């Protein structure tokens, strides 16, 4: 009977520039019918110019873009503080969700 | 003698001689300072190679934004304990969003190093460590001995020839805690303090390595081409 | 047997690690030596018996495409590393859509090397050259021990003759070397420091190069080239 | 379902197994071979869940395998037979049973005899002179009771399945796209190259 | 629960345990293998301190890992069942995931892997057995013959012996072994290889043993009237060489 | 002979000598004291300078378990904190199922039981310590000592270390002098005393002097570190009370 | 952490299993116990050679009784026997009471506590037993039997026999007086006889335990209502049979 | 290496078995136990010759149940590790079985576990002498006594220590005088007197409040004298 | 911690020989003599028991001659309770067969199970081997009537007449001059009864210290177990023994 997911709204939108990219979100938090808050940020910088937003359940959002960002600390510490290219990043975060794939993570994720 | 063929083992007068020469281990190594102001921490590492053919062996491991260490002794005893220590400050920032104390880390560090002194099969860290590290209470330097001893200093140095550099730092104490604001003049009072530990040698940019840590400087490595200004 | 496998002696060292070393010093010649324009591995195949087919003697493996290695000692204790080493380059690949690092491979089979008490019952009793390339550092050889302590080289000569050879190889060596002088001056080294005469059956050459990978050459390259060595030796 | 049947004569086990491999409103394939020689002297065929089938079936077929070039030895038919009835049995209570049936045909060369097993998924074997599995039983049990003699030979062994896939070619209501059909006798197995 | 390192090293540099199996191996009956231009062909000695052994039933020297790969050994025979089994297994399992038989190359590296395995971990000694394994890959008629020894090493061979008495046959081997003109026919081979037996086996014939391998999984051993015919045979032209001068 | 080899073994004699061995490790280390007061108990430690490049004030000696006991001890410092995270570990599983914090004889008996399943086998070693430890609980003060080989009890008074015979002959000398019992203040002063006292065994090196109390109505029944004013007053006291 | 997973009981050179032969010591440096079989029952009887005259000896029994049908009787070191008889009770039920709802034949049960000591003979970081058991027993199909149980684990039936200090003795002594028509009462003298011979002191119902595996002692049932349940055939003796049996003696 | 780990010496001895016995008289203490008509004493020597000690907490005598109260003869160590179990014994036999464990019965246990640090090489035996004692609600009053050999008995009367030899043949002269299996009492005051009593004829010494630890078991309790207890009791034998 | 006392059972001698193996077949040396010898129609084993005593109940006696299935059996020499554990899991391995494939075990797979079992104690797990050597008679559709022998090293051979045990080498001797290819099985029984009598170290061959057996043939195989009067009357026929 105990649900473990919720829909906390929000939309998000990623457009390719030719030397640039924008990742845009709404900061509206929500539950049900109610406002959980006007200003909770969702579009995240993860740091080597990589920016993140995993929406849809704020729970698992949250706990995928911490992981991301842990992932890319473990990779600084383990390869001589190699920038991690975009690519990279998209097969780690496919890998990272994937491991979920019985239980997933209830978000829609743009890098 | 006869007391020295594993940890668990004290002797007639009450030492852990697998510890010693684990210690012993150390002093072999290559030297490494370590010294502190109020809002700086800086690490000064020779780095020794095989032959003119060879690399010169990393001796400075980065732990998080603000800690840092050095190592002298066995190599990949040092990767096994910055790994777990970077765990730690992993985990303190991703279960409480805080910065791990220098000092925590230093008791973490004690009582893994401990666990190996007291059981059998295993044997203790053939390593040492100097870590320096800027928390919510300022700029601190450490020493750690895989006996588990772990010292809050201003300053220090262990490896071979260590001695002078103590000294010293010993001596400079009073001049060098108030270097205050001003990175590279720490960063001299470094490198003059591992000066004192050469023996026919002299510092160059292929064997010298510099780290410091502070208020509003986060856990940077100097190797190579950047030590040449401190030369 | 008197004492723990993980013992220090008086001094500072690991016992079995230096026993260890003891036996490495006893495998067969191994050189590599980096350039510019890729790094060379040659080994000393050193056939026991005339009736052995040299062929079956792998001293160098191929671990990823841009990573090869050359081992030195006990080469039975190598079987399980280069796996490990393979896997690791491959599983990188599949986490990361990337190479891995030279660098990254040498550490990640060093991490292997002291896994060992009462884990397998005993160090590693063979030493490794790893040679490779990626975008960052491009060529580079690594020397890995039973120790877990990995160096890297210019020139590395590892197994029995390692100290004459290493000397020849810090006289020869220099950062203008190219890939064909690099191939030569192993050939002459293995062929001084053997006590076979070198031909193209008792040693092996291989390259790393940016384009075309780990390639391990065929007899009859290596055959040319030591032809080539010996008219620059008549010559001179 | 899929067409599984068997009939066992004087000298000589025929098995007759249905070519299609259908998934949805798709026939996949129409050439199937529905069986794996298990040794020299004896075949089994199969037909149940999809993947099942064929997982278990080579299973069955590396364990005996490895037997005869452990021993240096064929098992007899019933060995065989007892052997994978009890590998059915074990695997209805685990985790995830096999739903695969299975019919045996060999030629005990110690017997010098034709030996048929019948076993489901649920680990029940039996012997018999003809057996099928699926609803094909429900068409060619009848057929064979009045037309099957104990002494016949291996060419009305082969009229008589003829007779029985015509019967399910005009009564059964799926296209199972004919049968590859197998004979095991003294000198092994063999394949009828064409039954149309 | 038992994991105390048994194979270490010493302090020259040697793991004393796999050369106590090397010399097991050296105490073993001898073994040996010759590859001919279309054949391999696998002679071992046996021993004949006993007399009332039922040659029906007891374990030969040469054991079939598959329908086209043959082992045989030297050393303790146990530690080679242990081995045999092992080897069979894998070859079954590759047969069930690769859909194609091992390769005597493969099946070598997976026997020397599991004898190097049994050198370096806990509570186990290492096998006392050094092994020749011959046969054809699959769709192939280069033969192959391969050595494998205690530590894990293992090497191609175009001929090769192992156990007591080794240095001699190999030495007969070297002698007369040309790799330009390696036997013809199966007849050679075999002659070869009982003249290699000769040189060791005292007492000849039912002491030796032959098992022949030709491609695609044609296994044979012949009974001691043809290995006593070959035999006679060689010691028909040894009398002969022996007072024609 | 041999019988010193290895640990849980009985000699002839019917002892154990590898913890009479970490006996002399423990003997080896710096001099730490506990008191007992009318409501409370002190505990008190000397800290080797080796240089001054040690930074003063910093490398605390004593742990607080719980939030009412105290813990020094005497040896290798690292089995200290090991003991010291049992204890903690001992502390907490008593509060989660008793829901009242450990009383100190209970702790007393935890720490006893885990040093003496540390002479049980050959496959550890006996705890290089000696720890004077305790507390206020609902039955008032208790100040407890633990050897290496298991055994522990309670005193008045209790010293270990290389000065730890004049610290016993002072606290005889305060017990024989003080029937009512000491206040918690008297107590640290003369805590202060009696490690000034035992420092002449190191009297080459210089020493930090590091107190701690848990007193009933001095500190409420908690443990709290003694600094500031109160502890340059002991200081001081010991001062001139060495002239 | 039990680290010791290695045997304790090792070949010599010269073949012998070191462990095993002291614990033979021991056993033959224990009191006297003795075995005799008769053709309507078994005897099984020692001696209580008491530590302290303000012990009480009535409370430690060497004489136990394994299953109704069962007992058992030893030389050697008392604990080990204790340890010994819990096993072999608690075996008689896991691995056949609980089965078949009988009681295990004897030679089964002997078979079952020779497994236990043989293992305690080879398993890791274990010494063996140093006990020796006479098992005196009955059962519907092999009637009434003795049997012998040594550390090694190995067993053997006796028509009577004795072990610990004075075996020799004693086992001479028995094979003098042992014949196949023997009744009941008639091996009770006899084991009388032999024991008398290996004690010095005090010889009474108070100093020497004495057990039967007899007739079926309905009264000792406990219950009445089931006639296929008859009482149990073990029968430990009282200091006063003892004492009736010696003025005849 | 038969002397260091469990396992028998040519001889067929355990002498790890025998050095744990030598053991258990270190603390130099002497202990004895009676019975009366419907109670059960114990008197142990208390020694507290460091002035700093907290008298109150030397003792050697415990309280492992309502019913059993157990004297060890041994290092403290040992001693409480031996309580502990016990304890723990007596408690988990009760949640499990409904009733009160008697005192035989946990001697059996606690015998049989220092059995098997006999047989088994990793554990050393305890170097500990337990005397358990109660009134057992079948049995009456008892004192059973377990030894690092795993071996125990029941006992009229018993005593251990350094010079238990003395007062043991006290106690038997006193019952072959007697000719009962008991202290013919019917308070436990005065059985506690007759043990004092004979424990200074047997030592040869006088005791005052201070060197005396007393236990009384009595039907559905066990408990401990203080030193007033053992005071008036001292008086009460004086006055003889 | 016990690495002291680890006699190191699985190890190789300089040599390559197997220490503990080497010692056990030492110590079966001494264990009373088996012999097996398969005629044509049957197989016959004789052994002669060492635990000998006039009180000894040999009729309930069985210390040499075992019962694995209704094909097989087996002579021990050597440490009967090890030998014991082994038969009984070389029973439970026969119904296993039996209840997989429903056909009796061939003598040959029984045989190799057990040897193998045998190899695992020398080569892992620092245990003891079993001091004991088999001799398997046996009787299966593929090979008829078999003979095996197996020893502490987990090594098995196959024989036509065979002895283990004490003084083996005579034994084998006298075997060799007299076994014929074509004897039948009362021959053989009558050649086991004289190597005995000859290789006995004892003062005569009496049946009080002899076990026997015999599997013979109706397509189905009888195994008889002597009990001692027919002993007696076989040692009579024989002419050992005179009534
Ligand atoms: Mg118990
Ligand atoms: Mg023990």
Not at chain 5, 200 to 211: D, F, P, R
Not at chain 9, 194 to 208: E, G, I, Q
Request: charged share 25%; proline share 3%; with cysteine.
């Amino acid at each position: 009977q105990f649900n473990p997911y919720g829909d906390n709204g929000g939309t998000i939108l990623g457009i390719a520039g030719e030397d640039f990219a924008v990742l845009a979100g709404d900061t509206r938090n929500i539950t049900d019918y109610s406002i959980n808050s006007r200003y909770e940020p969702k579009v995240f910088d993860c740091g080597d110019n990589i920016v993140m937003s995993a929406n849809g359940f704020a729970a698992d959002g949250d706990a995928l873009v911490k992981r991301f960002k842990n992932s890319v600390k473990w990779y600084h510490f383990d390869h001589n503080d190699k920038k991690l290219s975009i690519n990279s990043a998209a097969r780690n975060i496919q890998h990272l969700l994937y491991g979920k794939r019985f239980f997933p993570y209830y978000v829609h994720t743009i890098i | 003698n006869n007391y020295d063929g594993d940890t668990v083992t004290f002797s007639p007068t009450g030492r852990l001689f697998q510890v010693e020469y684990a210690l012993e281990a150390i002093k072999q190594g290559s030297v490494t300072v370590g010294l502190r102001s109020n809002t700086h921490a800086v690490l000064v590492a020779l780095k020794r190679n095989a032959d003119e053919l060879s690399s010169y062996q990393k001796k400075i491991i980065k732990c998080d934004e603000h800690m840092g260490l050095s190592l002298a002794g066995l190599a990949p005893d040092a990767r096994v304990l910055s790994n777990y220590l970077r765990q730690q400050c992993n985990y303190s920032s991703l279960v409480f969003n805080r910065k791990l104390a220098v000092e925590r880390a230093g008791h973490l560090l004690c009582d893994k190093a401990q666990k190996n002194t007291q059981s059998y099969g295993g044997r203790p860290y053939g390593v040492g460590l100097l870590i320096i590290g800027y928390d919510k209470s300022g700029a601190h330097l450490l020493e750690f001995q895989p006996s588990g001893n772990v010292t809050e200093l201003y300053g220090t140095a262990i490896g071979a020839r260590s001695q002078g550099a103590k000294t010293y730092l010993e001596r400079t104490l009073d001049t060098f805690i108030k270097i205050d604001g001003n990175p590279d003049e720490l960063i001299k009072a470094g490198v003059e303090a591992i000066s004192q530990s050469l023996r026919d040698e002299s510092l160059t940019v292929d064997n010298l390595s510099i780290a410091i840590v502070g208020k509003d400087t986060p856990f940077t490595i100097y190797d190579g081409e950047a030590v040449a200004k401190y030369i | 047997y008197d004492r723990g496998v993980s013992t220090f002696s008086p001094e500072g060292r690991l016992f079995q690690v230096e026993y260890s070393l003891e036996a490495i010093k006893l495998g067969s010649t191994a050189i590599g030596i980096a350039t510019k324009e890729g790094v060379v591995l040659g080994v000393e195949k050193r056939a026991t018996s005339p009736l052995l087919e040299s062929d079956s003697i792998e001293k160098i493996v191929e671990i990823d495409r841009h990573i090869g290695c050359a081992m030195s000692g006990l080469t039975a204790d190598a079987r399980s590393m280069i796996e490990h080493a393979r896997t690791a380059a491959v599983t990188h690949n599949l986490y990361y859509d990337e190479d891995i690092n030279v660098e990254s491979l040498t550490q990640s089979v060093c991490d292997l090397a002291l896994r060992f008490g009462e884990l397998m019952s005993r160090p590693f009793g063979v030493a490794l050259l790893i040679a490779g390339h990626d975008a960052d550092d491009g060529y580079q050889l690594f020397h890995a021990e039973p120790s877990g302590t990995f160096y890297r080289y210019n020139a590395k000569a590892i197994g029995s003759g390692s100290e004459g050879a290493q000397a020849e190889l810090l006289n020869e060596w220099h950062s203008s070397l190219t890939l064909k002088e690099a191939e030569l001056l192993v050939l002459k080294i293995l062929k001084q420091v053997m006590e076979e005469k070198l031909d193209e059956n008792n040693a092996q050459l291989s390259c790393i190069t940016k384009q075309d990978g780990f390639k391990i050459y065929d007899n009859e390259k290596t055959a040319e080239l030591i032809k080539e060595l010996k008219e620059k030796e008549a010559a001179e | 379902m899929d067409i599984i049947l068997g009939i066992r004569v004087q000298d000589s086990v025929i098995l007759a197994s249905s070519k299609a491999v259908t998934r949805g409103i798709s026939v996949l394939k129409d050439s199937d071979d529905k069986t794996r020689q298990l040794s020299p002297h004896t075949l089994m065929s199969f037909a149940g869940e999809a993947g099942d089938t064929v997982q278990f079936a080579e299973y069955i077929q590396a364990n005996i395998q490895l037997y005869s070039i452990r021993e240096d030895y064929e098992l007899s038919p019933q060995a065989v037979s007892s052997f994978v009835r009890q590998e059915l049995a074990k695997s209805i209570r685990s985790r995830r049973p096999y739903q695969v049936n299975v019919l045996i045909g060999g030629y005990d060369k110690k017997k010098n005899k034709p030996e048929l097993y019948q076993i489901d998924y649920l680990g029940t074997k039996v012997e018999l002179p003809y057996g099928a599995h699926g609803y094909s039983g429900f068409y060619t049990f009848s057929l064979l009771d009045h037309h099957y003699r104990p002494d016949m030979t291996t060419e009305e062994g082969l009229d008589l399945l003829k007779l029985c896939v015509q019967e399910l070619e005009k009564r059964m209501p799926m296209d199972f796209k004919g049968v590859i059909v197998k004979i095991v006798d003294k000198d092994g197995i063999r394949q009828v190259d064409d039954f149309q | 629960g038992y994991d105390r390192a048994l194979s270490i090293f010493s302090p020259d540099g040697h793991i004393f345990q796999v050369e106590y199996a090397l010399e097991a191996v050296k105490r073993g009956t001898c073994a040996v293998g010759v590859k001919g231009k279309n054949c391999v062909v696998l002679g071992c000695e046996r021993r004949s301190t006993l007399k009332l052994q039922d040659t029906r039933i007891t374990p030969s020297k040469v054991s079939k890992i598959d329908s086209h790969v043959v082992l045989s050994f030297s050393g303790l025979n146990a530690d080679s069942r242990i081995l045999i089994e092992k080897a069979r297994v894998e070859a079954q399992s590759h047969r069930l995931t690769l859909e194609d038989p091992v390769t005597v190359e493969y099946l070598t590296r997976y026997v020397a892997g599991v004898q190097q395995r049994y050198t370096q971990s806990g509570g186990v000694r290492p096998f006392g057995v050094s092994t020749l394994i011959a046969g054809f890959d699959p769709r192939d008629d280069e033969p192959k013959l391969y050595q494998t020894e205690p530590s894990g090493i293992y090497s191609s061979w175009s001929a090769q012996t192992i156990g007591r008495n080794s240095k001699t046959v190999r030495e007969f081997l070297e002698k007369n072994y040309d790799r330009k003109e390696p036997p013809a026919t199966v007849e050679e081979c075999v002659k070869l290889t009982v003249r290699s037996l000769l040189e060791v086996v005292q007492t000849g014939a039912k002491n030796i043993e032959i098992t022949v391998v030709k491609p695609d999984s044609d296994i044979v051993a012949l009974s001691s009237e043809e290995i006593n015919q070959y035999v006679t045979q060689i010691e028909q032209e040894k009398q002969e060489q022996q007072e024609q001068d | 002979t041999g019988y010193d080899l290895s640990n849980s073994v009985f000699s002839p004699d019917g002892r154990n000598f590898q913890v009479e061995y970490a006996v002399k490790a423990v003997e080896n280390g710096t001099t730490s004291i506990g008191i007992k007061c009318n409501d409370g108990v002190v505990f008190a430690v000397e800290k080797l300078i080796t240089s001054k490049l040690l930074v003063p004030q910093k490398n605390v000696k004593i742990q607080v378990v719980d939030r009412h006991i105290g813990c020094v001890y005497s040896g290798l410092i690292p089995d200290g904190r090991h003991l010291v995270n049992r204890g903690r570990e001992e502390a907490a599983s008593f509060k989660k199922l008793y829901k009242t914090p450990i009383p100190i004889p209970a702790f007393a008996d935890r720490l006893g039981q885990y040093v003496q399943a540390h002479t049980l086998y050959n496959s550890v070693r006996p705890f290089g310590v000696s720890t004077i430890f305790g507390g206020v609980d609902k039955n008032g003060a208790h100040l407890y000592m633990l050897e290496p080989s298991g055994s522990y009890w309670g005193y008045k008074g209790a010293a270990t270390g290389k000065g730890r015979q004049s610290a016993k002959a002072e606290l005889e000398k305060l017990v024989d002098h003080h029937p009512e019992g000491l206040s918690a203040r008297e107590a640290v002063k003369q805590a202060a005393k009696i490690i000034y006292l035992a420092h002449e065994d190191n009297k080459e090196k210089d020493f930090e002097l590091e107190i701690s109390w848990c007193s009933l109505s001095e500190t409420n029944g908690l443990h709290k570190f003694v600094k500031g004013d109160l502890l340059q007053e002991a200081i001081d006291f010991a001062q001139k009370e060495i002239n | 952490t039990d680290r010791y997973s290695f045997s304790l009981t090792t070949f010599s050179p010269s073949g012998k299993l070191g462990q095993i032969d002291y614990a033979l010591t021991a056993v033959k440096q224990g009191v006297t116990s003795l075995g005799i079989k008769a053709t309507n029952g078994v005897v099984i009887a020692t001696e209580k050679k008491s530590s302290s005259p303000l012990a009480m000896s009535e409370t430690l029994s060497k004489v136990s009784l394994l299953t109704p049908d069962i007992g058992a009787v030893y030389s050697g070191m008392g604990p080990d026997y204790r340890v010994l008889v819990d096993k072999s009770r608690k075996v008689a039920h896991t691995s056949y009471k609980r089965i078949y709802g009988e009681y295990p034949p004897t030679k089964l049960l002997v078979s079952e506590v020779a497994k236990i000591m043989q293992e305690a003979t080879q398993s890791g970081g274990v010494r063996p037993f140093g006990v020796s058991l006479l098992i005196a027993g009955h059962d519907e199909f092999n009637g009434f039997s003795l049997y012998q149980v040594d550390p090694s684990g190995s067993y053997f039936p006796w028509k009577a026999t004795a072990i610990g200090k004075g075996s020799v003795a004693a086992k001479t002594f028995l094979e003098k007086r042992w014949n196949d028509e023997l009744e009941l009462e008639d091996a009770i003298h006899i084991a009388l006889l032999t024991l008398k011979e290996s004690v010095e002191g005090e010889f009474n119902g108070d100093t020497i335990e004495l057990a039967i595996i007899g007739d079926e002692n309905p009264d000792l049932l406990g219950y009445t209502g089931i006639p296929t349940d008859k009482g149990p055939r073990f029968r430990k003796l009282t200091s006063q049979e003892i004492n009736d049996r010696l003025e005849a003696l | 290496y038969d002397r260091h780990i469990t396992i028998f010496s040519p001889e067929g001895r355990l002498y790890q078995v025998e050095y744990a016995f030598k053991a258990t008289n270190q603390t130099n203490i002497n202990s004895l136990a009676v019975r009366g008509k419907d109670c059960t004493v114990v008197i142990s020597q208390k020694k507290v010759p460091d002035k700093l000690l907290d008298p109150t907490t030397v003792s050697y005598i415990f309280c492992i149940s309502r019913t059993i109260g157990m004297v060890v003869n041994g290092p403290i160590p040992d001693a409480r590790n031996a309580a502990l179990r016990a304890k723990a014994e007596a408690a988990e036999f009760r949640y499990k079985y409904g009733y009160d464990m008697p005192c035989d019965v946990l001697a059996k246990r606690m015998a049989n576990l220092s059995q098997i640090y006999t047989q088994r090489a990793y554990m050393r035996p305890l170097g500990v002498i337990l005397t358990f004692v109660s009134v057992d609600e079948e049995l009456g009053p008892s004192i059973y006594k377990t030894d690092p050999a795993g071996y125990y008995v029941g006992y009229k009367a018993t005593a251990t220590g350094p010079k238990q030899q003395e007062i043991t043949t006290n106690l038997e002269n006193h019952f072959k005088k007697s000719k009962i299996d008991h202290i013919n009492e019917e308070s436990w005051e005065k059985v506690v007197e007759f043990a004092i009593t004979h424990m200074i004829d047997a030592l040869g010494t006088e005791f005052s409040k201070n060197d005396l630890e007393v236990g009384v078991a009595t039907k559905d309790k066990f408990f401990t004298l203080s030193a007033e207890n053992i005071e008036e009791r001292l008086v009460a034998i004086a006055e003889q | 911690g016990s690495r002291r006392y680890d006699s190191r059972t699985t190890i190789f001698s300089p040599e390559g020989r197997l220490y503990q193996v080497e010692y056990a077949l030492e110590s079966i040396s001494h264990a009373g003599t088996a012999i097996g010898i398969m005629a044509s129609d049957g197989i016959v084993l004789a052994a002669e028991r060492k635990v000998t005593s006039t009180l000894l109940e040999q009729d309930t006696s069985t210390e040499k001659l075992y019962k694995l299935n209704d094909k097989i059996a087996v002579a021990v020499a050597g440490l009967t309770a090890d030998a014991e554990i082994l038969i009984n899991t070389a029973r439970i391995h026969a119904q296993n067969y039996l209840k997989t494939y429903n056909e009796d075990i061939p003598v040959e797979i029984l045989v190799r199970r057990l040897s193998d079992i045998k190899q695992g104690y020398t080569q892992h797990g620092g245990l003891r081997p079993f001091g004991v050597s088999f001799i398997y008679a046996g009787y299966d559709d593929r090979y008829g009537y078999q003979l095996y022998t197996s020893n502490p090293s987990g090594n098995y051979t196959g024989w036509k007449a065979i002895s283990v045990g004490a003084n083996t080498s005579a034994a084998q001797t006298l075997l060799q001059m007299d076994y014929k290819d074509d004897m039948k099985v009362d021959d053989a029984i009558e050649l086991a009864l004289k190597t005995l009598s000859k290789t006995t170290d004892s003062s005569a061959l009496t049946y009080d210290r002899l076990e026997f057996a015999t599997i013979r043939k109706d397509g189905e195989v009888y195994q008889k177990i002597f009990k001692p009067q027919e002993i007696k009357d076989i040692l009579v026929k024989t002419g050992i023994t005179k009534k």
